[PDB]
Write an enzyme that holds these catalytic residues in place. Structure first.
Site, PDB file in Angstrom:
ATOM      1  N   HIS A   1      41.829  42.924  40.475  1.00 18.40           N
ATOM      2  CA  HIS A   1      42.792  43.824  41.562  1.00 18.40           C
ATOM      3  C   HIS A   1      43.076  45.278  41.389  1.00 18.40           C
ATOM      4  O   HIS A   1      42.396  45.512  39.773  1.00 18.40           O
ATOM      5  CB  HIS A   1      44.229  42.764  41.126  1.00 18.40           C
ATOM      6  CG  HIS A   1      43.679  41.611  41.278  1.00 18.40           C
ATOM      7  ND1 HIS A   1      44.374  40.577  42.374  1.00 18.40           N
ATOM      8  CD2 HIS A   1      43.242  40.421  40.572  1.00 18.40           C
ATOM      9  CE1 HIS A   1      43.994  39.686  42.545  1.00 18.40           C
ATOM     10  NE2 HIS A   1      43.649  39.328  41.083  1.00 18.40           N
TER      11      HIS A   1
ATOM     12  N   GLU B   1      46.118  40.697  38.770  1.00 16.09           N
ATOM     13  CA  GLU B   1      46.853  41.703  39.155  1.00 16.09           C
ATOM     14  C   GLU B   1      48.307  42.200  37.996  1.00 16.09           C
ATOM     15  O   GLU B   1      48.663  40.863  37.369  1.00 16.09           O
ATOM     16  CB  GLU B   1      47.396  41.241  40.208  1.00 16.09           C
ATOM     17  CG  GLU B   1      48.282  42.559  41.710  1.00 16.09           C
ATOM     18  CD  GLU B   1      47.862  43.958  41.470  1.00 16.09           C
ATOM     19  OE1 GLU B   1      47.311  45.499  40.479  1.00 16.09           O
ATOM     20  OE2 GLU B   1      47.341  44.792  42.324  1.00 16.09           O
ATOM     21  N   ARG B   2      48.904  43.238  38.233  1.00 19.89           N
ATOM     22  CA  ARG B   2      50.508  43.426  37.756  1.00 19.89           C
ATOM     23  C   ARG B   2      51.306  42.406  37.602  1.00 19.89           C
ATOM     24  O   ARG B   2      51.717  42.426  39.160  1.00 19.89           O
ATOM     25  CB  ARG B   2      50.313  45.203  37.748  1.00 19.89           C
ATOM     26  CG  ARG B   2      51.825  44.952  37.263  1.00 19.89           C
ATOM     27  CD  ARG B   2      52.175  47.111  37.360  1.00 19.89           C
ATOM     28  NE  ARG B   2      53.186  48.005  36.423  1.00 19.89           N
ATOM     29  CZ  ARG B   2      53.697  48.366  36.859  1.00 19.89           C
ATOM     30  NH1 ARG B   2      53.744  49.252  37.666  1.00 19.89           N
ATOM     31  NH2 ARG B   2      55.236  49.030  36.664  1.00 19.89           N
ATOM     32  N   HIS B   3      51.900  42.612  37.128  1.00 17.52           N
ATOM     33  CA  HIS B   3      53.357  41.300  37.616  1.00 17.52           C
ATOM     34  C   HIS B   3      54.374  42.639  37.284  1.00 17.52           C
ATOM     35  O   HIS B   3      54.759  42.721  37.005  1.00 17.52           O
ATOM     36  CB  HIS B   3      53.313  40.015  36.195  1.00 17.52           C
ATOM     37  CG  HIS B   3      53.949  39.343  36.445  1.00 17.52           C
ATOM     38  ND1 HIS B   3      55.665  39.852  37.338  1.00 17.52           N
ATOM     39  CD2 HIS B   3      54.390  38.039  35.868  1.00 17.52           C
ATOM     40  CE1 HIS B   3      56.561  38.225  37.143  1.00 17.52           C
ATOM     41  NE2 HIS B   3      55.749  37.782  36.500  1.00 17.52           N
TER      42      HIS B   3
ATOM     43  N   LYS C   1      59.221  47.936  50.626  1.00 23.74           N
ATOM     44  CA  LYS C   1      59.316  49.177  50.044  1.00 23.74           C
ATOM     45  C   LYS C   1      60.853  49.711  50.436  1.00 23.74           C
ATOM     46  O   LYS C   1      62.097  50.049  49.262  1.00 23.74           O
ATOM     47  CB  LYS C   1      59.284  50.457  49.940  1.00 23.74           C
ATOM     48  CG  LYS C   1      57.366  50.935  49.801  1.00 23.74           C
ATOM     49  CD  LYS C   1      56.979  50.167  48.665  1.00 23.74           C
ATOM     50  CE  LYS C   1      56.414  50.290  47.774  1.00 23.74           C
ATOM     51  NZ  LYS C   1      54.848  50.525  48.996  1.00 23.74           N
TER      52      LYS C   1
ATOM     53  N   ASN D   1      45.009  46.860  39.701  1.00 23.06           N
ATOM     54  CA  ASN D   1      45.388  47.223  37.953  1.00 23.06           C
ATOM     55  C   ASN D   1      44.981  46.937  36.810  1.00 23.06           C
ATOM     56  O   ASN D   1      44.582  47.967  35.452  1.00 23.06           O
ATOM     57  CB  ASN D   1      47.376  47.081  37.951  1.00 23.06           C
ATOM     58  CG  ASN D   1      48.195  47.585  38.789  1.00 23.06           C
ATOM     59  OD1 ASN D   1      48.011  49.173  38.682  1.00 23.06           O
ATOM     60  ND2 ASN D   1      48.578  47.579  39.789  1.00 23.06           N
TER      61      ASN D   1
ATOM     62  N   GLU E   1      43.040  42.728  52.099  1.00 29.82           N
ATOM     63  CA  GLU E   1      44.242  42.671  52.668  1.00 29.82           C
ATOM     64  C   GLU E   1      44.536  41.963  52.257  1.00 29.82           C
ATOM     65  O   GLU E   1      43.887  40.422  52.699  1.00 29.82           O
ATOM     66  CB  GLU E   1      44.539  43.576  53.688  1.00 29.82           C
ATOM     67  CG  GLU E   1      45.702  42.967  54.443  1.00 29.82           C
ATOM     68  CD  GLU E   1      46.173  42.817  55.742  1.00 29.82           C
ATOM     69  OE1 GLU E   1      46.743  43.733  56.474  1.00 29.82           O
ATOM     70  OE2 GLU E   1      45.601  42.476  56.728  1.00 29.82           O
TER      71      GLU E   1
ATOM     72  N   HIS F   1      40.034  43.323  45.721  1.00 27.36           N
ATOM     73  CA  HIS F   1      40.222  42.727  47.379  1.00 27.36           C
ATOM     74  C   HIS F   1      41.080  43.648  48.319  1.00 27.36           C
ATOM     75  O   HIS F   1      41.238  44.133  47.680  1.00 27.36           O
ATOM     76  CB  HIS F   1      41.000  41.358  46.536  1.00 27.36           C
ATOM     77  CG  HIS F   1      42.256  41.796  46.380  1.00 27.36           C
ATOM     78  ND1 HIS F   1      43.337  41.961  47.668  1.00 27.36           N
ATOM     79  CD2 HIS F   1      43.163  42.099  44.672  1.00 27.36           C
ATOM     80  CE1 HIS F   1      44.242  41.855  46.073  1.00 27.36           C
ATOM     81  NE2 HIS F   1      44.001  41.772  45.247  1.00 27.36           N
TER      82      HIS F   1
ATOM     83  N   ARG G   1      43.339  35.742  46.100  1.00 28.73           N
ATOM     84  CA  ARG G   1      42.660  36.584  46.646  1.00 28.73           C
ATOM     85  C   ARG G   1      41.518  37.724  46.251  1.00 28.73           C
ATOM     86  O   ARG G   1      40.473  37.602  46.966  1.00 28.73           O
ATOM     87  CB  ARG G   1      43.784  37.431  47.495  1.00 28.73           C
ATOM     88  CG  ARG G   1      44.474  38.243  45.922  1.00 28.73           C
ATOM     89  CD  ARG G   1      45.646  38.581  46.635  1.00 28.73           C
ATOM     90  NE  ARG G   1      46.866  39.095  45.584  1.00 28.73           N
ATOM     91  CZ  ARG G   1      47.621  39.200  44.630  1.00 28.73           C
ATOM     92  NH1 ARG G   1      48.166  38.240  44.449  1.00 28.73           N
ATOM     93  NH2 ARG G   1      48.391  40.388  43.810  1.00 28.73           N
TER      94      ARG G   1
END
Ligand SMILES: O=C(O)c1ccc(-c2ccc(Cl)cc2O)cc1NS(=O)(=O)c1ccc(-c2ccccc2)cc1
Ligand SMILES: [Cl-]
Lengths: 233, 242
Positions: A184, A87-89, A98, A186, A11, A9, A60
């Site tokens: 996702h 997705e990765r947690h 960031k 990952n 954005e 997916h 998503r």
């Protein structure tokens, strides 16, 4: 000569793909929706047909799949959803940008987490604003205590995705069903690493493009016969 | 009551705008039919409804209604099962014709017969029909046996092939405690309602389920309704549907 199609997916809302969106159920932004639209466009232009679709339980990815099925006029296909393609947690980092991550934990530790295959971020704790939102979400109510993560290393993410690949997706491919997977970064990394026999370092350097149909041609033993191909222009 | 079941009939299609018979032709929702589905989903959201599994047909006007509802109630993650057995009634050779073409070709007496009858099918969809390959050769029906793929259906036929899916696939889920949502079509939902309420042929033929409106059944452990169907929505919308 089996054909397998992956799509990652695009954005998500509120810049959450740059904020460790993780297990938070961020929707696609309008731009991410358009991305999925163009990927579906590409699949229909190339005349692709599928027999079954797999996706995560995160909207998503589900909405990416829906957009693709709409564009290729295959909304009637069977669809299977699983948390194992989530997705990765990202633990307590979930939702932070960031600069905030570096402010809270320092550049040294952030670099360690970024470069490590097997070190998880800190757990998502009860003071995290997503804690009850994710951990008490009804869609995970059947998970056991050690299945529902508070955080994941990349190793962890791949370790819970691959049992689903082996147990549910592989049998479909081996029966000749043309599989589409919408998921996702990952979780798709876990699949690609298994298919190509990549090293930890290599899978950590692999960054799959978004919204683009990724095509695999597999032999009798599900080994890719050539490098992954992208659909479009 | 022990169990709760929710049905929703999709709204206006692109071919409804052309007063054409769709049947198994896979017409999409019109913009207005899409908006109808959004309002029904909003009504389910306002009432706090939660589901555990969803059933729909293999026709996009029903599937898109389901999608719209799931989006509205933020339950896009639910398992979804699609089946041809929930498809709209197959109108056979009338598929693709509009009201005028149907009346012109067949005459008032024949069309009244078809309208009023529980068990007289329309003419079969023959291999030279303009939508024959589009429907009968669509790969989504590839696993149907030769006798399962209809050339035409009376209402009795439609109900006869919807009810095995109800009995074999949906009933076990309800008795397992799953909160079921069914998004389908007028005539397949008629099959379910006729079974639930024990209605006569006459009675089910006079029942016009409203479109885009959540239809709520409260069921005892034997799946017998404990009260008449309920419609979900605001005062205005529920009153229009009586
Ligand atoms: O009203 C509709 O146009 C109509 C359209 C479709 C159907 C219909 C057809 C097949 C099936 Cl399987 C189910 C249906 O419901 C019924 C209708 N209503 S009618 O009461 O039967 C009627 C049908 C013809 C005529 C007429 C014919 C020729 C010259 C002038 C007048 C006057 C009245
Ligand atoms: Cl779906």
């Amino acid at each position: 000569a089996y054909k397998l199609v992956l799509i990652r997916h695009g954005e998500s809302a509120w810049n959450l793909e740059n904020r460790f969106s993780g297990w938070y159920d961020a929707d696609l932004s309008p731009a991410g929706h358009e991305e999925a639209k163009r990927g579906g466009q590409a699949l229909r232009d190339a005349g692709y047909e599928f027999d079954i679709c797999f996706t995560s339980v995160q909207k998503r990815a589900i909405r990416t799949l829906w957009t693709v099925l709409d564009a290729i006029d295959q909304m009637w296909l069977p669809v299977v959803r699983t948390w194992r393609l989530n997705e990765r947690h990202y633990g307590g980092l979930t939702g932070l940008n960031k600069a905030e991550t570096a402010a809270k934990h320092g550049e040294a530790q952030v670099k360690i987490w970024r470069r490590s295959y097997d070190v998880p971020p800190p757990p998502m704790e009860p003071d995290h604003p997503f804690y009850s939102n994710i951990s008490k979400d009804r869609r995970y109510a059947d998970l056991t205590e050690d299945q529902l993560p508070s955080c994941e290393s990349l190793k962890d993410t791949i370790a819970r995705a691959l049992p689903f690949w082996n147990e549910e997706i592989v049998p479909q491919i081996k029966e000749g069903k043309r599989v589409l997977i919408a998921a996702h970064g990952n979780s798709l990394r876990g699949i690609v690493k298994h298919l190509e026999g990549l090293s930890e370092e290599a899978i950590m350097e692999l960054n799959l493009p978004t919204g683009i149909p990724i095509v695999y041609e597999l032999d009798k033993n599900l080994k890719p016969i050539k490098p992954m191909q992208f659909l479009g222009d």
